[PDB]
Amino acid sequence: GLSDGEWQQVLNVWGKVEADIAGHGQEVLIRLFTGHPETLEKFDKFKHLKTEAEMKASEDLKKHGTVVLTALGGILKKKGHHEAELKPLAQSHATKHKIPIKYLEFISDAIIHVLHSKHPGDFGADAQGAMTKALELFRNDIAAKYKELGFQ
Q: Which domains does the chain have, with CATH numbers?
């Protein structure tokens, strides 16, 4: 339930991310892992990352960041018509990776934080409002699939 104006703000902000998808992806995941170390335990391949320096130096972490933000970008460009894109991610995250919805809230908050940090004074109040609604829409739509699967 975003307006046309709100979707336009979302995809304008997303333009910023696309100019450096790997840099943004890395900073999001580092923000998530340092803020919520339980999220790092869900990745067998990042458990070895003890320090933030190790995270920063990890080319594989940056690669995962690219994968995640590429997928999210695809979803956002559907402007809420994203059932086909969400279905497999709900299934993998609930059934295989065992990711509680709470951790999706954590990464949503990390995206907002990273946008301010990399674009200080260039991520206006209207843009934060619109990006927040988009990310809540994503979370709400994943949550419905989690409930269908009985996932906690």
A: 1-96 (6.10.140.2100), 97-152 (6.10.140.2110)
